Amino acid sequence: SSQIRQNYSTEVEAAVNRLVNLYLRASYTYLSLGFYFDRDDVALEGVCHFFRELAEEKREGAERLLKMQNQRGGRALFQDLQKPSQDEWGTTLDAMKAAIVLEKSLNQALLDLHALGSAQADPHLCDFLEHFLDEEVKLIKKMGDHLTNIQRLVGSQAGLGEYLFERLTLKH
Amino acid sequence: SSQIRQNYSTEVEAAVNRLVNLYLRASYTYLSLGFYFDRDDVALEGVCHFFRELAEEKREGAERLLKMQNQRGGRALFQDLQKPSQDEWGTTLDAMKAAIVLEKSLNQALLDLHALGSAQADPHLCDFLEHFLDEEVKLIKKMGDHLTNIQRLVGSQAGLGEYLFERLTLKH
Amino acid sequence: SSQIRQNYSTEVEAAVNRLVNLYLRASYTYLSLGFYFDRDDVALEGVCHFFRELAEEKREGAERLLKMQNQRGGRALFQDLQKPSQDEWGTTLDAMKAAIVLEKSLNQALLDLHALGSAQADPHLCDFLEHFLDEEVKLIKKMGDHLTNIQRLVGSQAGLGEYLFERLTLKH
Amino acid sequence: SSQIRQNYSTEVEAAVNRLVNLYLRASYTYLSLGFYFDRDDVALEGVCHFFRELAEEKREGAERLLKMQNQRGGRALFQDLQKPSQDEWGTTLDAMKAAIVLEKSLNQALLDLHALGSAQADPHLCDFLEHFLDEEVKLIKKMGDHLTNIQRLVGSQAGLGEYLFERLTLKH
Ligand SMILES: [Pd+2]
Ligand SMILES: [Pd+2]
Ligand SMILES: [Pd+2]
Ligand SMILES: [Pd+2]
Ligand SMILES: [Pd+2]
Ligand SMILES: [Pd+2]
Ligand SMILES: [Pd+2]
Numbered sequence: 001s002s003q004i005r006q007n008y009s010t011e012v013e014a015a016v017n018r019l020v021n022l023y024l025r026a027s028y029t030y031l032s033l034g035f036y037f038d039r040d041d042v043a044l045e046g047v048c049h050f051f052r053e054l055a056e057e058k059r060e061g062a063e064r065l066l067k068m069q070n071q072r073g074g075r076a077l078f079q080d081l082q083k084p085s086q087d088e089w090g091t092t093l094d095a096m097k098a099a100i101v102l103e104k105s106l107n108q109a110l111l112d113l114h115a116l117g118s119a120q121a122d123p124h125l126c127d128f129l130e131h132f133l134d135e136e137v138k139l140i141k142k143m144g145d146h147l148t149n150i151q152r153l154v155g156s157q158a159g160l161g162e163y164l165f166e167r168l169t170l171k172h
Numbered sequence: 173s174s175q176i177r178q179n180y181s182t183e184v185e186a187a188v189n190r191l192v193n194l195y196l197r198a199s200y201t202y203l204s205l206g207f208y209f210d211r212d213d214v215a216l217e218g219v220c221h222f223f224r225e226l227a228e229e230k231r232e233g234a235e236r237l238l239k240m241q242n243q244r245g246g247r248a249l250f251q252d253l254q255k256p257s258q259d260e261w262g263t264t265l266d267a268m269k270a271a272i273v274l275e276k277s278l279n280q281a282l283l284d285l286h287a288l289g290s291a292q293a294d295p296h297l298c299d300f301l302e303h304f305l306d307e308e309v310k311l312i313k314k315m316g317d318h319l320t321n322i323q324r325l326v327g328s329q330a331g332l333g334e335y336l337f338e339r340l341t342l343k344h
Numbered sequence: 345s346s347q348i349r350q351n352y353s354t355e356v357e358a359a360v361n362r363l364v365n366l367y368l369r370a371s372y373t374y375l376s377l378g379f380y381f382d383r384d385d386v387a388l389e390g391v392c393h394f395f396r397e398l399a400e401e402k403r404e405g406a407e408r409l410l411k412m413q414n415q416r417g418g419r420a421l422f423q424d425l426q427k428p429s430q431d432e433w434g435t436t437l438d439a440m441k442a443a444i445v446l447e448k449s450l451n452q453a454l455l456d457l458h459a460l461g462s463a464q465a466d467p468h469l470c471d472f473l474e475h476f477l478d479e480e481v482k483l484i485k486k487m488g489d490h491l492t493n494i495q496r497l498v499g500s501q502a503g504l505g506e507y508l509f510e511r512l513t514l515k516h
Numbered sequence: 517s518s519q520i521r522q523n524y525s526t527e528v529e530a531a532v533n534r535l536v537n538l539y540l541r542a543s544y545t546y547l548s549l550g551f552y553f554d555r556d557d558v559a560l561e562g563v564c565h566f567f568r569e570l571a572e573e574k575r576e577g578a579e580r581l582l583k584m585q586n587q588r589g590g591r592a593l594f595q596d597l598q599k600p601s602q603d604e605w606g607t608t609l610d611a612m613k614a615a616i617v618l619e620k621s622l623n624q625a626l627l628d629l630h631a632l633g634s635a636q637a638d639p640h641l642c643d644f645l646e647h648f649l650d651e652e653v654k655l656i657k658k659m660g661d662h663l664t665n666i667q668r669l670v671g672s673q674a675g676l677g678e679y680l681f682e683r684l685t686l687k688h
């Protein structure tokens with residue numbers, strides 16, 4: 001029951017649903033990261049804000065994919081959202097490392113989807129991901145920049161460096 | 173590891189975590205409801221908007237609970253988010269009925285939490301839910317109003333009534 | 345006699361000329377659809393406006409293709425514009441069905457052209473269609489949405505439903 | 517001699533007078549803390565400002581309680597204000613620890629008063645404390661956040677950390 005579907009493979013439709021799940025899972029992970037840094041015994045507001053902003057971005061990405069699914073005449077199918085991989089996230093450095101791992105996995109899923117689109121001769125999908133692809137590269141570059149600065153600040157005054165990074169790099 | 177926790181029972185802490193899960197689940201359900209009404213073979217924009225707005229409201233509720241959890245020195249614990257109970261939601265009437273069922277369950281969970289707060293002599297919790305409690309009563313009243321209007325419009329021109337309700341009651 | 349042509353195949357050049365013809369033909373079809381709904385014995389202004397707007401959009405598309413043809417050093421070649429397939433277009437539903445058929449055919453021609461561009465290793469063409477491709481998907485989604493609403497409104501009060509759709513969905 | 521008193525127990529009236537004393541004592545303690553950090557041999561302006569702001573807040577709280585006492589037809593009774601527990605307050609960390617101890621004691625007194633109100637079936641009192649209760653939870657969370665940051669900054673460059681916290685966290 002679609003009267004509009006054209007050149008939209010069942011393979012891409014399913015891959016888009018899986019990507020929505022991955023984006024929502026990422027959003028959930030960032031929600032957990034954000035609130036961890038808001039704990040009174042962690043108390044790094046710039047870090048909390050950074051991850052809460054990412055939770056919003058990932059949710060927005062999922063919503064864009066869902067809009068596209070309907071635009072193409074595919075059917076959204078939702079699965080459980082697995083809880084994030086940790087309950088406590090360690091240091092800012094630990095968290096930023098986890099975030100980059102997460103983003104690399106999202107990026108790989110985008111790359112896999114683009115490849116499927118190319119194999120299926122689906123240029124609209126290709127065009128649509130173009131939005132996701134650059135945004136992801138920009139985000140990963142930012143995270144790498146952050147990680148380098150966090151790492152430079154460890155030294156052997158780790159608490160001091162963690163405070164200074166949150167105060168002087170992150171938005172608060 | 174909290175230096176601030178005071179008069180905040182482990183029972184309430186756990187109940188707050190469960191309530192966060194219920195709110196996030198509700199948000200997820202509303203996301204699914206919203207996109208269903210955006211299908212080209214359903215195509216009721218006012219209904220899509222209504223449920224997408226509710227998805228945002230429920231997410232906001234979860235975020236408020238998480239902020240409060242940290243304010244009190246409790247620790248957020250996240251669980252899986254179960255997928256919504258249906259993949260396709262039927263008519264506007266079916267959907268509005270499902271929504272009221274969902275809201276009644278959230279309201280009951282709020283009532284249960286307030287009762288626990290009262291049993292634990294936790295007035296801050298009581299005060300905090302006061303926000304949730306009125307918002308929920310207002311929302312359920314609105315949904316009941318909608319259901320009555322949807323029901324009046326069935327008659328034996330169901331398609332006509334569904335169109336008119338979306339056009340003339342819902343925001344588009 | 346071009347001093348600029350580079351990586352622009354004769355196959356793509358010809359396909360672009362054919363696409364210009366298809367867009368102009370579509371524009372002509374929409375002109376006819378628009379004026380049919382302006383007949384005193386049809387008199388559905390929102391429908392007239394919808395199709396007249398599409399006539400303008402298709403003409404604009406042809407003009408964009410012609411601009412691109414010259415940008416690449418190809419040579420515009422015009423053919424006859426075949427008259428639209430009907431002189432009278434029936435109900436709003438009949439017309440919207442005809443419109444979606446027309447758009448699917450344009451979309452297929454765009455897809456065919458992108459495939460040719462990919463086969464000819466012509467990335468500028470690919471980039472250029474990216475504009476056409478999303479606009480077409482958006483338009484077809486809109487038409488599918490319209491068709492669903494028109495269909496819901498037939499019931500057995502067809503005149504009533506046709507009036508209400510024109511009044512409450514379409515711009516007038 | 518009141519013509520307005522209704523449902524206002526002598527127990528609550530007395531507890532309100534004691535709470536006014538506790539708030540005024542807290543204000544006095546914060547006055548002392550503030551001026552200590554303004555000493556030329558301490559010289560941490562952000563810390564001075566933080567505690568002077570709290571002195572004002574506590575005085576305001578006492579004034580609100582006194583207004584409520586009269587609104588209910590109770591009679592304000594003032595006792596001596598005991599001098600603060602220290603003449604010199606040590607490091608920012610020492611001071612912030614003392615402040616949280618002080619706030620926990622105020623919060624416990626508020627909780628005790630709410631419990632008395634509930635036992636006496638005095639809902640206006642309950643409503644009134646609702647203002648005090650959330651403000652106190654917010655303040656204690658802030659103090660806990662501060663303490664965590666101060667503690668992270670000790671390291672073995674304590675002077676450096678104390679300076680940086682005052683410069684980069686506190687308002688100056
Ligand atoms: Pd924070
Ligand atoms: Pd934040
Ligand atoms: Pd919609
Ligand atoms: Pd919407
Ligand atoms: Pd007209
Ligand atoms: Pd017109
Ligand atoms: Pd000063």
Ligand SMILES: [Pd+2]
Pocket residue numbers: 561564565566568
């Ligand atoms: Pd000051």
